[PDB]
Motif scaffolding. Structure first.
Motif, PDB file in Angstrom:
ATOM      1  N   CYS A 188      51.742  33.890  34.361  1.00 59.04           N
ATOM      2  CA  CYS A 188      51.986  34.148  35.430  1.00 59.04           C
ATOM      3  C   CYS A 188      51.502  33.037  36.579  1.00 59.04           C
ATOM      4  CB  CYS A 188      51.019  35.281  36.073  1.00 59.04           C
ATOM      5  SG  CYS A 188      51.336  36.929  34.936  1.00 59.04           S
ATOM      6  N   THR A 189      52.448  32.381  37.200  1.00 56.27           N
ATOM      7  CA  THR A 189      52.170  31.245  38.167  1.00 56.27           C
ATOM      8  C   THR A 189      52.400  31.520  39.636  1.00 56.27           C
ATOM      9  OG1 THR A 189      52.979  29.741  36.293  1.00 56.27           O
ATOM     10  CG2 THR A 189      52.900  29.091  38.430  1.00 56.27           C
ATOM     11  N   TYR A 190      51.128  31.257  40.159  1.00 60.93           N
ATOM     12  CA  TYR A 190      51.271  31.526  41.801  1.00 60.93           C
ATOM     13  C   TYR A 190      51.206  29.988  42.311  1.00 60.93           C
ATOM     14  CZ  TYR A 190      49.622  36.350  41.243  1.00 60.93           C
ATOM     15  OH  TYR A 190      49.496  37.662  41.020  1.00 60.93           O
ATOM     16  N   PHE A 238      43.944  38.803  31.402  1.00 58.13           N
ATOM     17  CA  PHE A 238      44.065  37.495  31.415  1.00 58.13           C
ATOM     18  C   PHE A 238      42.836  36.579  30.839  1.00 58.13           C
ATOM     19  CE2 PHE A 238      46.502  38.060  35.950  1.00 58.13           C
ATOM     20  CZ  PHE A 238      47.573  38.175  35.013  1.00 58.13           C
ATOM     21  N   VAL A 285      45.356  34.854  49.697  1.00 55.20           N
ATOM     22  CA  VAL A 285      45.157  34.570  48.313  1.00 55.20           C
ATOM     23  C   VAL A 285      44.359  36.087  47.761  1.00 55.20           C
ATOM     24  CG1 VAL A 285      45.322  32.186  47.912  1.00 55.20           C
ATOM     25  CG2 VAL A 285      43.066  33.260  48.546  1.00 55.20           C
ATOM     26  N   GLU A 286      43.957  36.922  48.738  1.00 58.36           N
ATOM     27  CA  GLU A 286      43.080  38.125  48.352  1.00 58.36           C
ATOM     28  C   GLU A 286      43.716  39.008  47.255  1.00 58.36           C
ATOM     29  OE1 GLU A 286      41.796  40.682  51.740  1.00 58.36           O
ATOM     30  OE2 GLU A 286      42.216  42.383  50.315  1.00 58.36           O
ATOM     31  N   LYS A 287      45.034  39.093  47.438  1.00 61.11           N
ATOM     32  CA  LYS A 287      45.634  39.926  46.213  1.00 61.11           C
ATOM     33  C   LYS A 287      45.694  39.379  45.136  1.00 61.11           C
ATOM     34  CE  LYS A 287      47.183  43.921  48.441  1.00 61.11           C
ATOM     35  NZ  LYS A 287      46.356  44.954  49.154  1.00 61.11           N
ATOM     36  N   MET A 288      45.861  37.965  45.087  1.00 57.56           N
ATOM     37  CA  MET A 288      46.126  37.353  43.801  1.00 57.56           C
ATOM     38  C   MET A 288      44.853  37.376  43.028  1.00 57.56           C
ATOM     39  SD  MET A 288      46.840  33.036  43.341  1.00 57.56           S
ATOM     40  CE  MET A 288      45.236  32.642  43.935  1.00 57.56           C
ATOM     41  N   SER A 290      44.044  40.511  41.429  1.00 60.97           N
ATOM     42  CA  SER A 290      44.911  41.044  40.377  1.00 60.97           C
ATOM     43  C   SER A 290      44.287  40.492  39.127  1.00 60.97           C
ATOM     44  CB  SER A 290      46.377  40.281  40.448  1.00 60.97           C
ATOM     45  OG  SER A 290      46.421  38.857  40.081  1.00 60.97           O
ATOM     46  N   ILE A 291      43.311  39.498  38.932  1.00 61.94           N
ATOM     47  CA  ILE A 291      42.678  39.234  37.844  1.00 61.94           C
ATOM     48  C   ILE A 291      42.331  40.558  37.186  1.00 61.94           C
ATOM     49  CG2 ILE A 291      40.884  37.795  36.784  1.00 61.94           C
ATOM     50  CD1 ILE A 291      41.167  36.069  39.137  1.00 61.94           C
ATOM     51  N   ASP A 292      42.329  40.845  35.928  1.00 59.26           N
ATOM     52  CA  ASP A 292      42.020  41.784  35.180  1.00 59.26           C
ATOM     53  C   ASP A 292      41.574  41.127  33.614  1.00 59.26           C
ATOM     54  OD1 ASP A 292      44.153  42.024  33.833  1.00 59.26           O
ATOM     55  OD2 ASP A 292      45.003  43.846  34.747  1.00 59.26           O
TER      56      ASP A 292
END
Lengths: 277, 277, 277
Positions: free
Chosen positions: A129-131, A101, A90-93, A96-98
């Motif tokens: 954006c759905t993970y 959002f 989950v690190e890159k997910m 990616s929060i900026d």
């Protein structure tokens, strides 16, 4: 706006439904977890709050991060259940929060026990954006979990020395220390006296940080006047906590057998770090 | 405020007592020393000023940095004495100087000949940071020391070509050059003519920097009208000096056998770099 | 100011004379070429415009960058001729363009067929920086050159799906994707429906980007209502195009056999990227 804890979930297969309008807190918390070299994150969901637990790689530090349901925009959990998250996955997910959002939504469903849903929304362009993150039912580290008990307001009597640092001050102090040492002595004489942080490296460098005004760092001491409080502590994890700049203002508490507790709160997030020896 | 040179030291075992309210100059100077790959710094303390001497790794460049006692907040030295400082030992200390420190104090005591004290003060919270740095009584590099004589105002007659660059201009010129070359030709015809900086790399790239207005770079020339001044110089150390952005405005002086002198002054600090061949 | 295409060259041996007051566009374009790992740049000069052609390292992407003579400050070319530029040779030159340069001039002379001249001017101090770059008469990649035909306004009928991203949006989308995948599915049902960008990695992570408002991303679709448009595309080169932030606003066009065209225009520069499969 913030509606807090709901009686019923908007969706029906939901075991957990969470929404919050400051997703940046998740980014900074997971930067902290990365800095601690946490490999796996333990998650407890209950009907009142969600808690993230981890150890650092050295297993000496315990981190407990709580997000209070009544202080988020939407919260529902059916009961108490546990999830395990691979941090590296989950690190890159989370990184990616900026600014684009304005909402993070987290969902866990009964009919999909190995999936955790993270939904990010950009409202400028109606982008969603759905993970779907693979998660597990974790074996429980009970020592880690019960460390939470060891941070109740009541349990903090045998902490005779405490003070507060801003994020900037904490980062500065432990960056300065980490330049030259892994260990620091914290010393304070009983009474109205200065706080000392110091170390010695024979034939190279000694360093001494002295805080002359207890008032200016909100220091409280119950050290008996005629006694000296002196502990030697490791600082690696503290640099991590600092750099992660997750908070604003950080409370530091010291105990005579060398445990060090750091606490910070900011809206819905409460972050606790306990390090032993 | 600035009290300059004192007749007597505040402390009594003090052989040197120095205080200054712009500690950032020490940071940038030691960034310069790092860029030059200086391994050991030579320090001369006298009752009027403190001077830092070093060579670059190639031994071709000589750096002399002087801090004038009468222009600092507090200065006292008993006599002339020398100290040797390992640059790598103090690198992180000087890099730790930031906006939170409004004072740097330096102390050397008779009864502790192998220690140099650096004290940094944060006045917002009455925090005092004291470094004890191991130092030595240095063997003296006399060639280095006497290079100071070779930079007197009087000795600068045989410099027929000189001009000034802002920090930004110097960094730009020698970064641009360093991209493609280690050597540059400086050429200027006698009279009212442009300054040329140029090089040629066969079958790839040639580059030519021409300064058409002598006035705009404060260029002065005593080159006889019918003669051409042309030297070939190495630029590595110049990039270092530039990047270190220690100054504001830098005077550049050239001599016909290829020596290049760079000078800058800013309040209490005077920085001289002499490079030969 | 902008005088456009000239009938005669200021200099007489000039086969090409080009001047432009936004040299920063060359920097960003060559950052794009670097990101694509282009080794050699193909240049076509004609009496109306100069075009830069390159492939990416994977040979799957085709880049065509055109600078229109009538929209620059000065333009002259005698005829149609081709030049080859080693990208690595010119990389640092183009990266050296900054705010201090208000003009870029490019010259090619008959009597020096293997040289291309780049002249940069700093008007604050009358400084002129002249690069002489070795160039060659290139063998022509005809597939690459004719890809230009495949981007005429007329040829863009068989593109049933298109929309626009700002630079920020494009960078965000393909950075987010590149974190976890090399391939993405673009899907859109015929009619008034959302745009989907998504992928699945079994037993780790699936990700889905959905654009709910076609209007907000200027999406146009001619997909027949009852049909689904779905292509799988590689995203590496897109990250490159994004990061290079050369434009402002980027038009994206998709074709049913998976080709993806990106177009952006900003004053004199028109940039086209075609990627196949």
């Amino acid at each position: 706006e913030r509606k807090g804890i709901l009686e019923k979930p908007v969706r029906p297969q939901s075991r957990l439904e969470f929404s919050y309008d400051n997703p940046l807190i998740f980014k900074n918390l997971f930067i902290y977890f990365k800095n601690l070299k946490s490999k796996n994150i333990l998650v407890r969901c209950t009907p009142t709050e969600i808690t993230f637990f981890s150890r650092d790689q050295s297993q000496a530090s315990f981190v407990i991060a709580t997000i209070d349901g009544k202080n988020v925009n939407h919260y529902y959990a059916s009961d108490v259940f546990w999830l395990g998250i691979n941090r590296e996955l989950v690190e890159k997910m989370f990184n990616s929060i900026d600014r684009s959002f304005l909402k993070i939504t987290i969902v866990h469903r009964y009919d999909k026990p190995e999936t955790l849903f993270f939904i990010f929304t950009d409202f400028d362009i109606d982008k969603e954006c759905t993970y779907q993150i693979t998660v597990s039912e974790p074996e429980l580290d009970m020592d880690l979990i019960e460390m939470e008990k060891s941070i109740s307001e009541e349990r903090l009597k045998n902490y005779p020395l405490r003070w507060e640092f801003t994020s900037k001050q904490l980062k500065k102090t432990f960056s300065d220390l980490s330049n030259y040492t892994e260990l620091v002595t914290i010393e304070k004489l009983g009474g109205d006296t200065p706080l000392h942080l110091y170390f010695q490296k024979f034939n190279s460098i000694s360093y001494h940080e002295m805080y002359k005004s207890s008032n200016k760092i909100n220091l409280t001491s119950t050290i008996p006047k005629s006694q000296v409080f002196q502990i030697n502590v490791k600082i690696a994890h503290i640099k991590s906590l600092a750099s992660a700049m997750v908070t604003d203002k950080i409370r530091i508490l010291c105990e005579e057998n060398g445990n060090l507790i750091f606490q910070s709160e900011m809206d819905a997030l409460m972050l606790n770090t306990i390090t032993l020896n």
